[PDB]
Amino acid sequence: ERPTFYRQELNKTIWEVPERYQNLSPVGSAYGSVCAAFDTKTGHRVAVKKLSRPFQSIIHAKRTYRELRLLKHMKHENVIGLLDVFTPARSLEEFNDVYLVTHLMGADLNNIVLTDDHVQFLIYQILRGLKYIHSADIIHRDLKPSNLAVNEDCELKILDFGLHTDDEMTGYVATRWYRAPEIMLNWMHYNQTVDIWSVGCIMAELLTGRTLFPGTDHIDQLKLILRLVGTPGAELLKKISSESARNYIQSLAQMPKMNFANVFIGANPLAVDLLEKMLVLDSDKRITAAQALAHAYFAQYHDPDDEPVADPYDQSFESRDLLIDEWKSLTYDEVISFVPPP
Ligand SMILES: O=C1CC(c2ccccc2)=NN1c1ccccc1
Ligand SMILES: [Cl-]
Ligand SMILES: [Cl-]
Ligand SMILES: [Cl-]
Ligand SMILES: [Mg+2]
């Protein structure tokens, strides 16, 4: 049953991996270190990630379990999937290290970023993967061009699910430019509609070649957003939980929604229409992924018999309080029960 493992030291780290993985070469590294390799069982080039200190605290142990549960569930053409997971440990008593294996992704959408046909195909694939993700009541939370892998045939996969520090979100940073305003400013309990705001920001940028809302800080970014989509009406104001955030919003002079045909000059009128339905300030009123797939902009690609949904996903663990070793034991069980894809 158990494969043979071999050891080697690569850039100050000991890696112990099954013989099937060959020609390990470092390609990146606080969450872990990553090597590219060739998988002789499948023939794919793969990425192998060795987790750093996976069980050093309750918070870290629960994050390790969360990542493994999510990656084991995702089985969709437009979403990253898990090729393998392994540990050199022979028992729970000696279990300390976790390794995760995926397909090696080449370029992300940044490098690419285009005909209108290209934009149709790229955004279609993002929405097809999001319909699947949202059907399992999962929220990605961090959709942006660097988290979308694209190959030579324009085929796309969503990766790097949100599993973010205050400093990471400060200033003139791409880590904030794609976030929905209700989550950027903690206006209210958010839901899956935050991901659709992100898709609108991405689509606009593929059409113009420019970041839609490149704010120099949170407040500058909010001002850019409200200039395009208008200031809130009383209906949305009621839904903002913070009295102080409500107070700040009402300090701003009122502004009407702009004409999107005069912003996105020359774009396909169907693309302009779809952007007006994604970039809505009130998250209750945004288009959903399932609704967007049926929009006329995607008529060339839409096939309602080839847009699958996910098996149900139990996240009850997220409200559970456990000790370090109880999270560690749950993780061990998930490593040893992994069944590889066909
Ligand atoms: O978290 C990361 C980062 C990563 C990667 C970084 C640099 C170059 C190429 C790949 N691969 N991964 C990953 C690898 C295996 C399983 C899950 C995620
Ligand atoms: Cl092997
Ligand atoms: Cl181990
Ligand atoms: Cl990015
Ligand atoms: Mg990323």
233 vs 155: CA distance, rounded Å: 40
Q: Which of 25, 31, 34 to mutate to test the pocket of ligand 1 (most atoms within 8 A of CB)?
A: 34
Q: Which residues line ligand 1 (CB under 6 A)?
A: 27-28, 34, 47, 49, 100, 102
- CB within 8 Å of 187: residues ≥ 6 apart: 181, 239, 240, 241, 242, 245
Torsion of CA 309, 315, 316, 318, to 10 degrees: -160
- Nearest atom within ligand 1 for CA of residue 159: 18
Residue 202 burial (CB < 10 Å; 0-12/13-18/19+)? Answer: buried
Q: How many whole angstroms from 80 Cα to the centroid of ligand 1?
A: 10
Residue 43 burial (CB < 10 Å; 0-12/13-18/19+)? Answer: exposed
- CB within 8 Å of 98: residues ≥ 6 apart: 50, 51, 54, 64, 68, 85, 87, 331, 335
Approach to solving = X-ray
**Tokens 């209906």 sit on residue:** 235
CATH code for the domain defined by 109-298: 1.10.510.10
Q: How many whole angstroms from 90 Cα to the centroid of ligand 3?
A: 8
Q: How many whole angstroms from 108 Cα to the centroid of ligand 4?
A: 9
- Nearest atom within ligand 1 for CA of residue 67: 17
Closest CA to ligand 1's atom 17: 100
16 vs 301: CA distance, rounded Å: 44
Closest CA to ligand 1's atom 4: 34
Of all ligands present, the nearest one to the C-alpha of 54 is 3
Longest pairwise C-alpha distance within the chain: 69
137 vs 150: CA distance, rounded Å: 25
* Residues belonging to the active site: 160
The 3-class secondary structure across the chain, one letter per residue, is: CCCCEEEEEECCEEEEEECCEEEEEEEECCCEEEEEEEECCCCCEEEEEEECCCCCCHHHHHHHHHHHHHHHHCCCCCECCCCEEECCCCCHHHCCCCEEEEECCCEEHHHHCCCHHHHHHHHHHHHHHHHHHHHCCCCCCCCCHHHEEECCCCCEEECCCCCCCCHHHCCCCHHHHCCCHHHHCCCCCCCCHHHHHHHHHHHHHHHHCCCCCCCCCHHHHHHHHHHHHCCCCHHHHHCCCCHHHHHHHHCCCCCCCCCHHHHCCCCCHHHHHHHHHHCCCCHHHCCCHHHHHCCHHHCCCCCCCCCCCCCCCCCHHHHCCCCHHHHHHHHHHHHHCCCCCC
Q: How many whole angstroms from 126 Cα to the centroid of ligand 3?
A: 36
